[PDB]
Every structure is written in C-alpha cells, then in structure tokens.
Amino acid sequence: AFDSTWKVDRSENYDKFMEKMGVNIVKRKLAAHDNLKLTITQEGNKFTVKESSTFRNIEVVFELGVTFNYNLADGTELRGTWSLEGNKLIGKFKRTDNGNELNTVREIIGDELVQTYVYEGVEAKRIFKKD
C-alpha cells in the first residue's frame, strides 16, 4: 500500500554506499543528511512519489514493473523496476555508467519506512518516520 508522507530521521551507512558509487567528500556528507521527505500517492497502479530534500524537489511517477532512471543527486543514475511483492516494494535496479546490479527493498517496520539499498555488498538504510 505505502500511501502517506514520510520525513527522514536517520541515513545508516549511506556515506560508504556513495564511496562505492564514486563521489568527492561533499556529496557523502550533504546527501546522507539532505532532509528528504517522501509523499507517496498511488492514483491507478502508478505510484507518484514526491521526493523533497535540500538537493531536489521532484515527483518520481512509476508503474509496477516499468524500467526507469532513479537519480542519486551527485553524478549516478540507476535503471530498473520497483515491483510489489504483496506489501514490500522489491527494486530490481542496475547502474547506467558502471553496469553493476543493485538490490533495493522498500518496507514499513511498524511506523518507519526503510529503503534498504545493497550496492557491491554495502547495505545503506534511509529510514523515514510517518510525518
């Protein structure tokens, strides 16, 4: 289901994830602590995800199974699919420029949305409370 406004409390291991992408010592500090709010709205199969932070305020409009570019706000695109396994969004993604695969799991732990991004064995969790 997912449909709600979700402000970031914490961003766990996101600095080492952005080192394995390949960034300078600016985007590691700023994009881990950018104040990201996810307003998720599903109109008819398509999820309209309004992503508002210090870097960018944009709506990611995706149907379940469509291959799209997810942009990190640095110099890094991920091409792939958020698909719904019952109540969990399984993200089958890969890099445009490296070619390397990325598994990302969106799920609610009670009253907090975890987006669990695994790149090169390195797991990063951006954790958003209901707010």
Q: Which residues are annotated as a binding site for tetradecanoate?
A: 82, 106
Amino acid symbol at 123:
E
Which amino acids are annotated as binding site, given as ranges?
82, 106
Which amino acids are annotated as binding site for hexadecanoate, given as ranges?
82, 106
CA atoms within 13 A on the CB side of 52: 9
DSSP symbols for 71-128 = E-SSS-EEEEEEEEETTEEEEEEEESSS--EEEEEEEESSSEEEEEEEETTEEEEEEE
